[PDB]
């Protein structure tokens, strides 16, 4: 996907007495901001998490988010009845901006209710999602009247975010722009049947994310290769398993080949042996 910074929110409304919110900020898959709910302050997980922003601007953004989180739960409790919400329910939000090929930075904001699309932002206006139903159309026609909320959202999406994204991309280039070589190893999985075997190729520790793994008979791509999911390690690296359902003896002179940008053209090749 295109490079993107965004903050997210998860809000749980258990009863009209109780609610809870979780927040964080992200470069794509990599978390760079936490949020201390219990003290209403931001948590910077990288030395460059403030970007090129001043401690003045950061404190201003921190105060807007603190007021928003404080206010958001109360305003939902307040309007719950008029929206005919039954507890418990939950809400999620993501807002940010992404750098697209061609230089143009595109901002976005999306909200969900019960894990289902509820609204999104376009042309700096509220746009109800068909899945959000009557409540979504009621919400967008309502929020449009609070011009201060609309003003702040409009500024943060279109003024602050594009600046902050470029700032932070550069500020963290030492971590963001690096090549980490994977290690790879072979193993045998749970046999699919009798005589049959499952050849397993692990690839771990690569950065950045794109990667290519296939089971090989010499230069022939075994089209039966099943590719698992790319899974995270803690140290900003990834993990991937490629497996192949094969009959015994058919797994003779089979190799696992790994292409990755950090390998300088020297693919890892592991022969079953």
């Amino acid at each position: 996907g295109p490079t993107s910074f965004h903050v997210i929110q998860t809000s749980s409304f258990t009863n009209s007495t109780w609610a809870q919110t979780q927040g964080s900020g992200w470069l794509d898959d990599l978390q760079i901001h936490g949020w201390d709910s219990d003290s209403g302050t931001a948590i910077f997980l990288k030395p460059w998490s403030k970007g090129n922003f001043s401690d003045k601007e950061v404190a201003e953004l921190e105060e807007i988010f603190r007021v928003y989180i404080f206010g958001f739960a109360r305003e939902v409790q307040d309007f719950a009845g008029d929206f005919q919400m039954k507890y418990p329910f939950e809400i999620q939000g993501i807002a940010g901006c992404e750098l697209h090929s061609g230089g143009a930075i595109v901002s976005f904001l999306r909200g969900a209710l019960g894990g289902l699309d509820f609204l999104s932002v376009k042309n700096a206006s509220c746009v109800p999602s068909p899945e959000g139903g009557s409540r979504a159309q009621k919400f967008c026609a309502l929020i449009i009247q609070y011009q201060g909320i609309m003003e702040t959202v409009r500024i943060l999406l279109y003024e602050t975010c594009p600046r902050y994204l470029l700032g932070v991309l550069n500020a963290g280039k030492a971590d963001l722009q690096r090549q980490v070589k994977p290690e790879a190893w072979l193993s045998s999985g749970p046999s699919p049947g009798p005589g049959r075997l499952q050849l397993v190729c692990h690839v771990s520790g690569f950065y950045p994310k794109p990667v290519w793994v296939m089971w090989m008979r010499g230069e022939q791509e075994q089209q039966g290769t099943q590719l698992g999911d790319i899974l995270p390690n803690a140290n900003w690296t990834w993990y991937l398993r490629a497996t192949l359902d094969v009959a015994d003896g058919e797994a003779a002179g089979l190799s696992c080949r790994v292409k990755h940008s950090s390998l300088e053209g020297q693919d890892i090749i592991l022969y079953w042996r």
């Binding site: 997210i8 998860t10 749980s12 979780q22 964080s24 992200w26 978390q31 936490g34 939950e90 999620q92 969900a112 019960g114 894990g115 289902l116 699309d117 290690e183 190893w185 193993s187 045998s188 999985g189 749970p190 692990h202 771990s204 520790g205 698992g228 999911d229 899974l231 995270p232 390690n233 803690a234 993990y239 398993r241």
Partner: protein, 98 residues
């Protein structure tokens, strides 16, 4: 509408007994967000287990990474135990070695 969690277990490095390592349990695709996840050494909850802040995906389903440093032994079996509202009973997924 609820979504049950997918549960995948893996080690950072290939298993070498005596060599330090990291055991990972990635849990994803679940909704709502409340969830309980443990790593087991021979059936017993491991104490100091780190984990990620809540995040979610394009489709709004949630995901977490739990992990811990450890050193595998010939005798030791390792697994990941996840409880969630969509699970009528805790789900265990073992760590496979060769």
């Amino acid at each position: 509408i609820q979504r049950t969690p997918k549960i995948q277990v893996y080690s950072r490095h290939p298993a070498e007994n005596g060599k330090s390592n990291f055991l990972n349990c990635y849990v994803s695709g679940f909704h709502p967000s409340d969830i309980e996840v443990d790593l087991l050494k021979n059936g017993e909850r491991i104490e100091k287990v780190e984990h990620s802040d809540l995040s979610f995906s394009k489709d709004w389903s949630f995901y977490l990474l739990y992990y811990t440093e450890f050193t595998p032994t010939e005798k030791d079996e390792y697994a990941c135990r996840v409880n969630h509202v969509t699970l009528s009973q805790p789900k265990i997924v073992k760590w496979d070695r060769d």
